[PDB]
Design an enzyme around this catalytic site. Structure first.
Site, PDB file in Angstrom:
ATOM      1  N   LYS A  17      27.549 -32.788 -48.816  1.00 35.13           N
ATOM      2  CA  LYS A  17      27.025 -31.771 -47.911  1.00 35.13           C
ATOM      3  C   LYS A  17      28.067 -31.406 -46.859  1.00 35.13           C
ATOM      4  O   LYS A  17      28.238 -32.120 -45.870  1.00 35.13           O
ATOM      5  CB  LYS A  17      25.739 -32.259 -47.243  1.00 35.13           C
ATOM      6  CG  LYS A  17      24.715 -32.818 -48.217  1.00 35.13           C
ATOM      7  CD  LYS A  17      23.305 -32.685 -47.670  1.00 35.13           C
ATOM      8  CE  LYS A  17      22.270 -32.841 -48.772  1.00 35.13           C
ATOM      9  NZ  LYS A  17      20.922 -32.393 -48.327  1.00 35.13           N
ATOM     10  N   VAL A  18      28.757 -30.290 -47.080  1.00 31.53           N
ATOM     11  CA  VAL A  18      29.872 -29.887 -46.227  1.00 31.53           C
ATOM     12  C   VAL A  18      29.330 -29.121 -45.027  1.00 31.53           C
ATOM     13  O   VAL A  18      28.710 -28.064 -45.182  1.00 31.53           O
ATOM     14  CB  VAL A  18      30.886 -29.041 -47.009  1.00 31.53           C
ATOM     15  CG1 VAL A  18      31.650 -28.121 -46.069  1.00 31.53           C
ATOM     16  CG2 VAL A  18      31.841 -29.937 -47.783  1.00 31.53           C
ATOM     17  N   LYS A  32      32.284 -33.873 -45.039  1.00 30.73           N
ATOM     18  CA  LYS A  32      31.520 -34.041 -46.269  1.00 30.73           C
ATOM     19  C   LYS A  32      30.937 -35.448 -46.250  1.00 30.73           C
ATOM     20  O   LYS A  32      31.644 -36.428 -46.498  1.00 30.73           O
ATOM     21  CB  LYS A  32      32.380 -33.813 -47.507  1.00 30.73           C
ATOM     22  CG  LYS A  32      31.563 -33.770 -48.789  1.00 30.73           C
ATOM     23  CD  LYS A  32      32.439 -33.632 -50.012  1.00 30.73           C
ATOM     24  CE  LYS A  32      31.628 -33.812 -51.283  1.00 30.73           C
ATOM     25  NZ  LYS A  32      30.502 -32.838 -51.378  1.00 30.73           N
ATOM     26  N   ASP A 125      38.434 -28.022 -61.542  1.00 26.83           N
ATOM     27  CA  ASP A 125      37.298 -27.322 -60.951  1.00 26.83           C
ATOM     28  C   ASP A 125      37.781 -26.178 -60.074  1.00 26.83           C
ATOM     29  O   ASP A 125      37.220 -25.911 -59.007  1.00 26.83           O
ATOM     30  CB  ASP A 125      36.417 -28.287 -60.152  1.00 26.83           C
ATOM     31  CG  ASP A 125      35.025 -27.732 -59.883  1.00 26.83           C
ATOM     32  OD1 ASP A 125      34.564 -26.859 -60.649  1.00 26.83           O
ATOM     33  OD2 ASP A 125      34.388 -28.179 -58.902  1.00 26.83           O
TER      34      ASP A 125
END
Ligand SMILES: O=C(c1nc2n(n1)[C@H](c1ccccc1)C[C@@H]2F)C1CC1
Ligand SMILES: [Br-]
Ligand SMILES: [Br-]
Ligand SMILES: [Cl-]
Ligand code: NA
Ligand code: NA
Ligand code: NA
Ligand code: NA
Ligand code: NA
Ligand code: NA
Length: 269
Positions: A17-18, A32, A125
């Site tokens: 969860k940034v 994070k 990614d």
């Protein structure tokens, strides 16, 4: 600078969860939070050394890992703050991004990936959400999904912890056995290129995930005719070269830079 062992008390209380965080003496940072649950001190030395390893990837186009939070039942990674968010947010903003800036963004992404590949890092990614933008529209490549933080990613999924396919090379769609390579990253870059000029995500007409996956594997690519603003013909050729089906036929990032940089300088800058 090396990775700082920061403390939760170092940051202003902002429970409600940034996410954005304010260090008491260093200022704005990105946090994070990775793990929150029972005590698992057995992994501390392993988590710290991995952060130290990642922190050694130092380049002007690579986000800096400023610190780590390693406490009883709480583990977080602390990262440079990039004021403008990710690339897709910049592209969708109401204020248009001029061609000269888009060209510079592309060049900087190439520089960052050339550095990472030179360090034997495969991103795996790469996508607009992992390309962060600062106040002056310079970019830095991030790994917000922890694709390269093996130890921290495992911590993130330990069950006792309370806490897109558009850019994936076709050889990886519907295939878990496939191991990503440097050429997987080049394909992702090709689709980022398209997004930079389309100002949006590709494949807006796809109706079903299985349709989309089977289509891309059969050769479908983002709709080049869908680019509405002026996209230099060299760049269209570039993205087509980088999303070729044969991975070993895609160029290297140093090879991309050798031809894009002189074009950027004579046409776009
Ligand atoms: O997104 C993160 C992050 N932290 C770092 N980077 N991204 C850089 C990097 C980029 C690409 C590939 C690998 C590392 C090196 C640095 F350590 C943190 C929040 C999880
Ligand atoms: Br071929
Ligand atoms: Br070019
Ligand atoms: Cl060059
Ligand atoms: Na710069
Ligand atoms: Na993707
Ligand atoms: Na879909
Ligand atoms: Na092809
Ligand atoms: Na050059
Ligand atoms: Na130059």
């Amino acid at each position: 600078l090396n990775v700082i062992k920061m403390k939760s008390s170092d940051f202003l209380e902002s429970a409600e969860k940034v996410s954005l965080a304010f260090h008491r003496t260093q200022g704005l940072m990105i946090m994070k939070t990775v793990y929150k649950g029972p005590n698992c001190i057995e992994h501390n030395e392993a988590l710290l050394e991995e952060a130290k390893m990642m922190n050694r990837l130092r380049h002007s186009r690579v986000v800096k890992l400023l610190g780590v939070i390693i406490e009883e039942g709480k583990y977080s990674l602390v990262m440079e703050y990039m004021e403008k968010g990710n690339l897709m947010h910049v592209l969708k903003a109401e204020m248009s991004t001029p061609l000269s800036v888009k060209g510079r963004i592309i060049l900087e992404i190439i520089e960052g990936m050339a550095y990472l590949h030179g360090k034997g890092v495969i991103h795996k990614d790469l996508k607009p959400e992992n390309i962060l933008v600062d106040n002056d529209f310079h970019i830095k490549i991030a790994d917000l999904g922890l694709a390269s933080f093996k130890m921290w990613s495992k911590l993130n999924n330990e069950e006792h912890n309370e806490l897109t396919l558009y850019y994936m090379a076709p050889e990886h769609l519907n295939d878990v056995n496939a191991k990503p390579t440097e050429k997987s990253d080049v394909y992702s870059f090709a689709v980022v290129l398209w997004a930079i000029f389309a100002n949006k995500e590709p494949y807006e007409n796809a109706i079903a995930e299985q349709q989309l996956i089977m289509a891309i594997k059969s050769g479908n690519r983002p709709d080049v005719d869908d680019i509405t603003e002026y996209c230099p013909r060299e760049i269209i050729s570039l993205m087509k070269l980088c999303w070729e089906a044969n991975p070993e036929a895609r160029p290297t990032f140093p090879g991309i830079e050798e031809k894009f940089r002189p074009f950027y300088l004579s046409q776009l800058e």
